[PDB]
Design a protein around this ligand. Structure first.
Ligand code: SF4
Length: 553
């Protein structure tokens, strides 16, 4: 196999036998074959748009297919085989439509050679063998490979956010059109300038999409607000909801009300605690456990059903006993785990089986007590702008350090905990995404009532951090966003974090420290372009990076 899309890739060059995440060769290869089919859909879908007859019937299929290939999202080979077969049928429909339109417009049959993605077909028996030859290493030129894969990796992060926006009824034609433009580009021989421009256009579409999801979430569930979240447990059985999807949360809360089954969040569902629409339910206890990578012992000790709305779902250890109470939904899949089917349009998902099962389970084992404070998304922080601005002017807050991003298992990530613990006491950490778990259970206190860790929410809520920075740029009358007293020390793991990075680069942020390692998918020449254009830096020692950041460097 070959896969190098997450921070944990083997030797920081690429997984070749079995993924460090657990992804087997067969699964990895099927994900490659799906992306190949998506490129075929894109070839025709882009041409139909160019001919003045766009077809948007595959918008949801494309978003969900990309999302299913994100790290820790879907482990069920049958789901991939089904998507590949459906994708081939969708592609052929577009092809037939295209051939007719082309003939009408040109007075002749289409006869130009096309990439194999546009024409290859087979039944499911043929998938495993074909998959071996349509992966990443089929691009021989290392720089073209780097730029094509950087594009696809950012694109699938954008697709995840777009899917959540679509679930909530929010969509923009430019997003769906760009999915096909970007996918199709990876089958064309383009100049370096053209390939880099596509990556920067993806960063701009990440801004669009992150803004759309921010709109979708807050319009539907209210603006996040300051909230104290219990991390201890109650005395009823519970259901633990993980991942990112807030519509799934809304439905789970409604369906569990009055049943005697409590609801707890996990991981990237922690920010559901911050939304007014959800805070109104007394049986919503709080947040259980830590970061995604600790889930094997924590899902075990939770004792009740676990619902995965998105990644990250980690494979079970041999000794784990919770498969029978593990539920997947949306793009998530796992062999042997019960899947909750998509809601009908205008309707809701059916979580009744989780509720019936939870009633048969013991309450969660308490693994800690206390609380987490959060809910500092853009509306809440801008509501406190006068207070924040005065603290900056008085010197009570000397600097903000953006430590948003995504966590992982490597021990080198102790760096983030140690930076948080050793930053001077007149600094404030701004966070969003599971990177927060390296420092959100410390006792850093507050500065004049402003907590020293301000959690804006999920990784998508990095959008709020950009809104806040842009507000502060305006208040302080600065010409360049980089001249604010803000440093960026971002942790990444998977593809959504890469989309957030590209959005920040599109917004003009320079000097970002990215860690705990730099992506394997940046070739030496591409890495050099990014360094020269954007001053991206690797992490150094805790002492050196704190001293540099405090100097604004
Ligand atoms: S998702 Fe990450 S750990 Fe898993 S196979 Fe790909 S690069 Fe390796």
């Amino acid at each position: 196999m070959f896969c190098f899309q997450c921070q944990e890739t083997a030797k920081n060059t690429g997984c070749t036998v079995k993924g460090m995440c657990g992804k087997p060769e067969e699964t990895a290869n099927l994900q490659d074959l799906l992306i190949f089919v998506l490129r075929g859909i894109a070839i025709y879908g882009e041409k139909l748009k160019e001919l003045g007859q766009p077809d948007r019937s595959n918008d949801d299929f494309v978003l969900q297919g990309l999302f299913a290939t994100i790290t820790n999202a879907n482990w069920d080979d049958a789901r991939f085989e089904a998507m590949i077969s459906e994708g081939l049928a969708r592609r052929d429909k577009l092809r037939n439509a295209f051939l007719a339109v082309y003939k009408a417009k040109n007075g002749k049959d289409f006869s130009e050679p096309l990439p194999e993605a546009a024409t290859w077909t087979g039944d499911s028996t043929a998938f495993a063998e074909k998959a071996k030859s349509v992966g990443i290493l089929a691009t021989e030129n290392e720089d073209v490979r780097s730029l094509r894969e950087l594009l696809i990796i950012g694109l699938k992060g954008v697709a995840a956010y777009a899917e959540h926006a679509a679930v909530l009824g929010f969509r923009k034609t430019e997003i769906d059109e760009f999915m096909l433009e970007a996918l199709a580009s990876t089958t064309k021989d383009l100049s370096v300038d053209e390939m880099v421009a596509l990556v920067m256009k993806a960063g701009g579409m990440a801004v669009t999409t992150m803004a759309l999801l921010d709109e979708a979430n807050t319009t539907t569930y209210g603006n996040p607000e300051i909230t104290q979240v219990n991390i201890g447990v109650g005395k009823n059985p519970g259901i633990l909801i993980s991942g990112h999807d807030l519509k799934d949360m809304a439905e789970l809360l409604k369906q569990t009300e009055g049943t005697g089954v409590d609801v707890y969040t996990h991981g990237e569902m922690l920010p559901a605690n911050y939304y007014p629409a959800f805070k109104k339910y007394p049986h919503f206890v709080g947040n259980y456990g830590g970061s995604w990578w600790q889930q094997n012992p924590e899902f075990e000790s939770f004792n009740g059903p676990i619902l995965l709305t998105t990644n990250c779902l980690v494979p079970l250890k041999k000794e784990n006993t919770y498969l029978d109470r593990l539920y997947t939904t949306g793009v998530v899949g796992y062999e042997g785990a019960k899947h909750i089917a998509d809601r009908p349009a205008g309707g809701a998902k059916d979580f009744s089986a989780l509720i019936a099962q939870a009633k048969k389970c013991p309450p969660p084992v308490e693994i800690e007590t206390g609380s987490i404070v959060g809910g500092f998304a853009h509306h809440q922080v801008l509501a406190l702008a006068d207070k924040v601005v005065e603290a900056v002017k008085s010197g009570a807050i000397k600097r903000f350090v953006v430590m948003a991003g995504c966590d992982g298992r490597q021990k080198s990530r102790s760096y983030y905990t140690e930076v948080a613990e050793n930053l001077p006491k007149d600094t404030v950490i701004l966070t969003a995404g599971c990177a927060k778990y390296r420092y959100n259970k410390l006792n850093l206190g507050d500065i004049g009532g402003i907590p020293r860790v301000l959690d804006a929410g999920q990784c998508n809520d990095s959008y709020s951090l950009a809104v806040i920075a842009l507000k502060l740029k305006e208040v302080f009358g600065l010409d360049d966003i980089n001249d604010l007293p803000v440093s960026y020390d971002i942790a990444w793991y998977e593809q959504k974090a890469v989309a957030v990075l590209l959005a920040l680069l599109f917004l003009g942020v320079k000097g970002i420290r990215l860690g705990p390692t730099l992506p394997a998918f940046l070739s030496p020449n591409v890495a050099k372009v990014l360094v020269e254009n954007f001053n991206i830096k690797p992490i150094g020692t805790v002492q050196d990076d704190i001293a540099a950041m405090m100097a604004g460097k």
